[PDB]
């Protein structure tokens, strides 16, 4: 019944080349969970615990939640984690799907394990996104940092084209979060 009911921990090591044995797909820049490519038996160096089916959603790496991040950021987390890599995953099927917009529209009971996870995933998504809003700019706000200030017509165009991962309304205005960009601007 719960979204988290099939969650499990799989512990792996990196291959001689330094790879995981499978590819990572998805990520928030594509509106998705990070999820595994095809998992071919024999390619993953498992240590001990449960194994992985193809295309499981990746939720945490060595206790750092990565669901809600871009693929770049997920891979950066893995780069700084030391073997063994404890991966929290859940297989796709039923109510569990890689689509982040569908997932963020699910309403879980407050305080439930499903709810706590959803809010962690939202915090990750908020790390690399600026919300858009149709309400006017206010004193002290930096356009493009606090908000993207757009018209209602623009907002609805973003909704219709699937660019928004979540949206809502409050005091006569629309609020929403678009997908983060695939590659961020270099910092150094």
């Amino acid at each position: 019944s719960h979204w988290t009911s099939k969650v499990h921990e799989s512990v792996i090591g990196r291959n001689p080349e330094g790879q995981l044995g499978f590819e990572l797909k998805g990520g928030a820049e594509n509106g998705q969970f990070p999820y595994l490519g095809e998992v071919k038996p024999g390619k993953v160096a498992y240590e001990s615990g449960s194994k992985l089916v193809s295309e499981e959603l990746l939720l945490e790496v060595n206790e750092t939640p990565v669901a809600g991040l871009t693929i770049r950021d997920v891979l950066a987390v893995i780069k700084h984690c030391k073997d063994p890599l404890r991966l929290k995953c859940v297989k796709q099927g039923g109510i569990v799907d890689k689509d982040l917009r569908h997932y963020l529209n699910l309403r879980f009971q407050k305080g439930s394990v499903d709810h706590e996870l959803q809010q962690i995933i939202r915090d990750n998504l908020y790390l690399r996104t600026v919300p858009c809003t149709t309400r006017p700019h206010k004193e002290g706000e930096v356009p493009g940092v606090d908000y993207i200030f757009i018209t209602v017509e623009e907002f609805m165009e973003l909704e219709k084209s699937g660019a928004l991962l979540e949206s809502g309304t409050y005091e006569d205005n629309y609020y929403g979060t678009p997908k983060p960009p695939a590659e961020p601007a270099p910092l150094l």
């Binding site: 908020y126 790390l127 600026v130 940092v145 606090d146 949206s167 409050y170 205005n173 609020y175």
Partner: peptide, 12 residues
């Protein structure tokens, strides 16, 4: 960045 109170109320 961190969402404001109005945002959180909107997407609850």
């Amino acid at each position: 960045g961190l969402r404001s109170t109005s945002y959180r109320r909107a997407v609850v």
